[PDB]
């Protein structure tokens, strides 16, 4: 129940079919900032590790980043010294079979600047890593801030009340109406 | 004020009437003159259309005074003799 | 020694609590003038700091890590 640093799933050293990447059951929602795949693809362990290192370097030691998927699915390739048709090749790499709509990385820190709605999110690390992923990506930020708590609505209502009051005083002072 | 509901503090928002009397001969009347110009500016007229502002050049010899009547109905008077940028002048002279 | 000297060591309310009071109206019946002036100063400070964070390009660590979460 306390916070923990769960160990990563291990690499399965079992030959498996190339197969197809099944679709996502539904939207994946996580508070904070998320980088979400937009098309299906299989991301290599090297690519995931590079993205993690870049995210850590950009954000800093004081901030924590969660890698949502892991490369456990084996993928094989033949040695150049083997002829055609002599069975499947040796394991060559490991991949995560990311569908469309799957979060790759996310940071759970909520945006503190609720009263500054015009300051839109900082996606610096996501921008740094996106052009290197083999998947198109979309940047998301969800902070559980609902419009019922919006401060801009109160600001607008106050401005409207002030305007109405000003027009009322101007009319009264000029005295063209009862 | 940006990203805020209520306006930045202004000492004219909740005043009903303001009258500034001052004499052109006495020194240290520039603060009174600046106040008169500000309260007669159209910017104050648009910001606080409720405000009534008046001023007078005293023929008699008396210090610069400001009388204020609040919306609640209270009345106050104050001496406004002072230096303003004359302060900066005196300081540069001192050093 | 002056009476106001005694209250200096007592910490003042931070921008978070002042915003709770004024932007959200939490306990606004007990708001004091000094509190509003402090809120007005700190709100402008935060505006300027966010503007600088957005228009920041150097490697300097002069930005508090809190503003990088905007």
């Amino acid at each position: 129940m306390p916070p923990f640093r769960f160990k990563a799933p291990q690499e399965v050293r079992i030959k498996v079919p190339i197969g197809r990447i099944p679709p996502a059951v539904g939207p994946e929602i996580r508070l904070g900032k998320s980088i979400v795949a937009v098309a299906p693809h299989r991301v290599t362990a090297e690519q995931l590790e590079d993205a993690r290192r870049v995210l850590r370097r950009v954000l800093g030691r004081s901030k924590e980043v969660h890698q949502n998927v892991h490369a456990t699915y084996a993928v094989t390739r033949k040695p150049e010294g083997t002829k055609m048709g002599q069975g499947k090749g040796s394991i060559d790499r490991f991949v995560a079979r990311v569908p469309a709509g799957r979060i790759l990385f996310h940071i759970p820190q909520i945006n503190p600047f609720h009263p500054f709605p015009e300051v839109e999110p900082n996606f610096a690390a996501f921008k740094a890593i996106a052009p290197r992923l083999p998947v198109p990506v979309v940047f998301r930020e969800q902070n559980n801030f609902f419009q019922m708590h919006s401060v801009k609505d109160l600001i607008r209502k106050r401005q409207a009340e002030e305007r109405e009051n000003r027009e009322k005083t101007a009319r009264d002072k000029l005295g063209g109406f009862h | 004020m940006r990203n805020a509901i209520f306006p930045r503090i202004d000492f004219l928002r909740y005043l009903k009437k303001i009258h500034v009397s001052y004499c052109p001969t006495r020194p240290k009347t520039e603060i009174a003159k600046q106040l008169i110009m500000r309260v007669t500016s159209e910017s104050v007229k648009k910001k606080f259309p409720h405000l009534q502002a008046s001023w007078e050049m005293l023929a008699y010899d008396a210090p610069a005074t400001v009388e204020v009547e609040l919306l609640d109905g209270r009345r106050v008077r104050r001496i406004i003799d002072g230096y303003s940028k004359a302060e900066k002048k005196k300081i540069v002279d001192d050093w | 020694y002056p009476a106001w000297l005694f209250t200096l060591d007592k910490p003042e309310k931070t921008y978070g609590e002042l915003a709770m009071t004024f932007l959200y109206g939490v306990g606004i019946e007990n708001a004091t003038l000094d509190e509003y002036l402090r809120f007005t100063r700190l709100h402008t400070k935060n505006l300027i700091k966010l503007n600088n964070m957005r228009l920041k390009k150097s490697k300097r660590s002069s930005v508090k890590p809190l503003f990088w979460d905007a």
Binding site: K157 | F6, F11, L70, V76 | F22, I28
Partner: peptide, 26 residues
Amino acid sequence: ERAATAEEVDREEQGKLSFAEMVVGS
């Protein structure tokens, strides 16, 4: 300075009244 600060101290009551009325109404 004077004058302005004293008057602002006087008017903080009405400022608070307006703030409370706004928050209560909304």
